[PDB]
């Protein structure tokens, strides 16, 4: 039982989930003092991201975020194991302070952040089993800023009203998941970290793309206002807002970059 | 026991100190979304700050920071109650990332931060009894940036190499504590928050001055490198670095500013 606000909020996660007070925690502020260019980092290749429009994919409000299930045929190459997709989900702020990304860059939050979660399918049978094991997970993070209307993100956002409450599910027709990625994916930040939610396992290889994408003011407000953390029938409904973790200490370590300027 | 790094670091404070997981936690990022000018915020008066040069004040390495005791005849006037001084202390980062303020401004961490802690002497007999009481504490924060040498801060820093280890103490001849404050003290941010160390009591009226002061690179390096969290005895010394808390969520709330933007 955990939240992002109140008694069971992030400073208390370590009570029930010891790893939330352990090693390698994410997210972090990405800033120049902890960055080191690594010329060996290569562009990731995204395979099977173009999902068939004749297929459909489950969108679930899980009480903490809205997730879209992704098929294990979607994978990334360019890492030292094949990683296969499991789901994507988002983090955001609130209409009074619409700056809810998890990673920050030079101190600055972006409006929101997409995570595409993959698991090490060379070592592990599925995502759950991978999640608390060495080299288990790889997550792609895309920073989102307010800007132009984004029809690709609308392929998810247009279904939000069908997953308003915890446990509610809706199907989303296949679309090209690559369209959720930015410009010049070749430039990114890379570091070893953790899940940013309980149980906070330090088993995540992060890739945060350097370049943000844009979604409109209206799209971001729709995201921030659409969802609730609680089930329909909860006596005390709670809006799903500010579902991002504060940045963690990141000391005597380095984030590697695929870009040197 | 509590620390800023490892199993007893800040995500685990709420285990021993429940208020660290409660409401009204400090420090925070001070950014436009959550700022509001309040014309009724008047200049504080700093009375008794010109400490007797014929008196000495105890400086102590307490294993968490370096603290200077201050006398109760030093006070702030301007609030609903008189608040009298109890001690001042600093927070800093480390030489590889010399950004260890507690409060941030528009996401920007300053080099270090000075806190001058006061208690409500009208209502309570001393700081320790005031600290878990409503209106109990008022802390002044001065953001510190690397630049020019600061002869006033050296009145404290020149003693650092003499309180290297936990429990060690020096005496500081009285000097004018107002010399530690930045220009235009009438310009500040004001909010209700907490102690930023265990027990994290939500009993602090914060006043963070708008303008930073400067200390030299050499001063900052001495502050970052002089001190240990451990006793002189210890065969496993721990460097007293990165002794700042990460910023806290601050939602549905405002910080009031005595300056307009
Ligand atoms: N931000 S993160 O990518 O570290 C993250 C979440 F924020 C998160 F909420 C989750 S979730 O499992 O609570 C579903 C909500 O999106 C996962 N999941 C990683 C994972 C995937 C499959 C099995 C176990 C863990 C997750 F990886
Ligand atoms: N950031 S802060 O201004 O809120 C702060 C500290 F950082 C700090 F280390 C201390 S400490 O040195 O006393 C030991 C850990 O709490 C206090 N102490 C304020 C205080 C003074 C007298 C009685 C009760 C609390 C304290 F108030
Ligand atoms: Zn996530
Ligand atoms: Zn302090």
UniProtKB/Swiss-Prot annotation, chains A, B:
Biological process, per Gene Ontology: chloride ion homeostasis; estrous cycle
Where, in this chain's numbering, is substrate bound?
Answer: 196-197
Reaction catalysis annotation? hydrogencarbonate + H(+) = CO2 + H2O
Q: Where in the cell is it found?
A: Membrane; Cell membrane
Name the Enzyme Commission number(s) assigned to this protein: 4.2.1.1
Active-site residues, Swiss-Prot/TrEMBL: 64
GO MF assignments: carbonate dehydratase activity; zinc ion binding
| Oligomer status and interactors | Homodimer.
State what protein this is by name.
Carbonic anhydrase 12
